RNA sequence: UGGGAGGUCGUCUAACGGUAGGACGGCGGACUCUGGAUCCGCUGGUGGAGGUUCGAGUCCUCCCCUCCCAGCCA
């Protein structure tokens with residue numbers, strides 16, 4: 001009888017703040033074997049959409065969040081749109097009017113900012129004309145409390161609160177009413193949402209017992225925030241899952257973070273969502289707001305790029321290119337595997353991984369100013385690039401140890417300083433001053449590609 | 464202000480009432496080469512006050528701040 005869901009809202013895209021709350025119900029529904037449902041909350045006709053109401057599922061899907069019921073697929077307890085159900089929220093909203101719980105509020109047409117009176121009677125002689133009309137829920141005295149699964153005994157004073165509209169003039173449910181209705185008809189066992197709703201729960205409870213139903217289990221976990229410590233959205237830089245996927249951040253690496261920022265770890269903070277099911281701590285999560293951190297995220301991501309199998313990585317890297325603009329060249333899979341096995345221990349993102357292996361692939365790579373302005377332009381940099389092609393020319397064996405021999409046997413030949421000899425060969429074959437092990441670089445780049453890049457630099461030296 | 468929720472290094476997080484520790488960042492070594500990366504190291508916090516105590520992040524009280532609900536937003 002376990003059925004937890006996630007009620008999104010079509011408004012641009014989804015960020016880590018929302019995804020994290022989604023990841024929870026996902027795992028939970030899996031640890032207990034319950035059903036996970038997807039319910040798009042688009043009751044706000046003003047900010048309604050479809051595009052932004054689609055980019056959400058794709059991302060979640062990319063996050064590895066599979067859902068049982070949803071609008072994208074089938075679903076008996078549907079429809080799954082807080083808009084394609086204006087036939088249900090109707091009769092129910094009118095049933096509350098019976099028990100004197102909901103009264104038709106008649107508004108003034110002359111001014112869209114004036115109220116007339118209160119009445120349970122149906123204002124046919126007003127709505128038919130033009131006078132906007134809604135439906136409010138009368139709040140009676142008392143204390144509407146509940147047992148939060150994280151906050152505990154949450155007691156509230158209905159007195160401090162009052163009649164709140166539950167039906168927009170355009171015959172559209174607001175939210176507190178839309179939730180209660182779909183949180184019962186869809187038979188939801190547990191409701192695990194953010195924390196900004198912890199204040200709305202009371203308003204909802206009064207609706208449950210109103211219809212004579214039985215509210216489910218409510219729990220409100222911390223909220224991922226930004227720098228100013230405000231509820232994460234988009235104004236906090238770029239915390240949209242869509243963004244990360246662009247920058248080249250793995251999925252398993254990001255997931256391992258959301259379940260690390262707020263939700264703790266029973267050992268090594270580095271892991272995956274799989275090996276964390278049976279060891280899921282529904283309550284042992286977080287209790288306070290958690291600021292998002294790119295640095296910790298990128299750090300965690302970079303590591304996953306080293307633990308996972310070599311094959312696993314390349315696959316994801318391939319898919320990334322298709323997502324982003326510029327694509328990958330055409331090279332030997334075994335050669336690509338090597339260069340991809342040498343540059344993976346330097347970059348912490350797929351973007352940085354591509355912008356570093358480019359020289360290993362394409363040969364029309366440029367030369368960063370640093371290299372030229374610092375070492376290359378040095379009058380005593382050409383003579384060093386001379387023996388660089390000579391010694392190597394003779395080298396019958398082209399491996400690390402061997403290539404390692406030549407290099408060191410140069411910096412100590414009066415030719416030039418230690419680093420000077422290394423940075424010249426480096427940028428000569430990579431075009432950058434920051435690349436993988438020079439012993440690996442010169443190695444993986446075979447013997448031919450090397451000599452060419454040595455010549456190239458030479459011919460260019462002449463400004 | 465009304466009502467809720469929460470405060471430990473810059474950030475995420477440990478501490479039977481009894482050592483404020485561990486990580487990311489940052490700064491520094493090392494890697495008989497580069498450094499985003501790799502091993503370690505290094506400072507850095509109890510939101511601020513009174514009191515109960517041999518002693519309090521931990522217990523009581525006052526003060527301060529932060530986020531949410533006080534929309535025909537969700």
Ligand SMILES: Nc1ncnc2c1ncn2[C@@H]1O[C@H](COS(=O)(=O)NC(=O)[C@@H](N)CCC(=O)O)[C@@H](O)[C@H]1O
Nearest residue numbers: 007008009017018021041193194195223224231232
């Ligand atoms: N800055 C933030 N940090 C961390 N969590 C955040 C968040 N902003 C929203 N959330 C949480 O993400 C989920 C979806 O957000 S949302 O698309 O706006 N939808 C809604 O708020 C409501 N339709 C949810 C209905 C319900 O569960 O009762 C909701 O659970 C919401 O509480």
